[PDB]
Design a binder for this molecule. Structure first.
Ligand SMILES: Cc1nc(C)c(-c2ccnc(Nc3ccc(N(C)C)c([N+](=O)[O-])c3)n2)s1
Length: 278
């Protein structure tokens, strides 16, 4: 750590604190994540150094020293959360939302093809640059925001799939469109019941095996499903159809990132330049 000079704090996640810092040996500006302290973890995190893609924030180095683990990432100038807040009055232009969703699906199709799951996607770990790119940051291993958590995780599935990332990305897609979080729960049950109130309480018909899930209770209230036309206006039919497939209850029915890339919603995708204030 003698080679790094902290500039300022940029985040505080579940695992640790993220700082903007300068590398004294190269002059590079980086995002440095400090985890306060697992040999299996050092090896798995070191494997993430090889996982390089244009839509993945580069993990430059993993430094294990003095009962701390430091992850050195490339630095990006803004997160999606700051951009969504900056764009709250006007909305993010639809061609930019579509570009960002397309790029994030490319990043997920890549990581998922290598059996790497993120498990905690949220606007704070989606990073953007001035050129129109957006990248996924800080993949997880096998106050906390629950807003983007897949229903199978809330219902106690410990052996979940890559479908958890598609669910989170669908929630973020809805939020870019409407400028409001889709399911802003403030407890595990509030989060689950907010999902049920919009998509209907799941049953064996739409999700086989749901009633045998560890935290499923037969006493859950039975709410009817709402129409997406009411949930994400003014998203067109291609966008609402894609979103509905990203939010299927059954992880096995939920669209994959690869299949989502071929969706007709992306027929006219372009790569616009965002209006960034840094
Ligand atoms: C939760 C996070 N984990 C990682 C690893 C993160 C990461 C990785 C690479 N670049 C960045 N840049 C970043 C993030 C957040 C901000 N806010 C202060 C808006 C900014 N800004 O300049 O403002 C830059 N963050 S952010």
């Amino acid at each position: 750590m003698e080679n790094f000079q902290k500039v300022e704090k940029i985040g505080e996640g579940t695992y640790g604190v993220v700082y903007k810092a300068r590398n004294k040996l190269t002059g590079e500006v980086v995002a440095l994540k400090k985890i306060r302290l697992p040999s299996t973890a050092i090896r798995e995190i070191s494997l993430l150094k090889e996982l390089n893609h244009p839509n993945i924030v580069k993990l430059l180095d993993v430094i294990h020293t003095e009962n701390k683990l430091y992850l050195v990432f490339e630095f990006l100038h803004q997160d999606l959360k700051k951009f969504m807040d900056a764009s709250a009055l006007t909305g993010i232009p639809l061609p930019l939302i579509k570009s960002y969703l397309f790029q994030l699906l490319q990043g997920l199709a890549f990581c998922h093809s290598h059996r790497v799951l993120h498990r905690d996607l949220k606007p704070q770990n989606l990073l953007i640059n001035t050129e129109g790119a957006i990248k996924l940051a800080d993949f997880g291993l096998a106050v906390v925001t629950l807003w983007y958590r897949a229903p199978e995780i809330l219902l106690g599935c410990k052996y979940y799939s890559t479908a958890v990332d598609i669910w989170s990305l669908g929630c973020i897609f809805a939020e870019m469109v409407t400028r409001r979080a889709l399911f802003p729960g403030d407890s595990e049950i509030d989060q689950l019941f907010r999902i049920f109130r919009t998509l209907g309480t799941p049953d064996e018909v739409v999700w086989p095996g749901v009633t045998s899930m560890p935290d499923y209770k037969p006493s859950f209230p039975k709410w009817a499903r709402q129409d997406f036309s009411k949930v994400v206006p003014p998203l067109d039919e291609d966008g609402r159809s894609l979103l509905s497939q990203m939010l299927h209850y059954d992880p096995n029915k939920r669209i994959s990132a690869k299949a989502a890339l071929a969706h007709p919603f992306f027929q006219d995708v372009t790569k616009p330049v965002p209006h960034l204030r840094l």
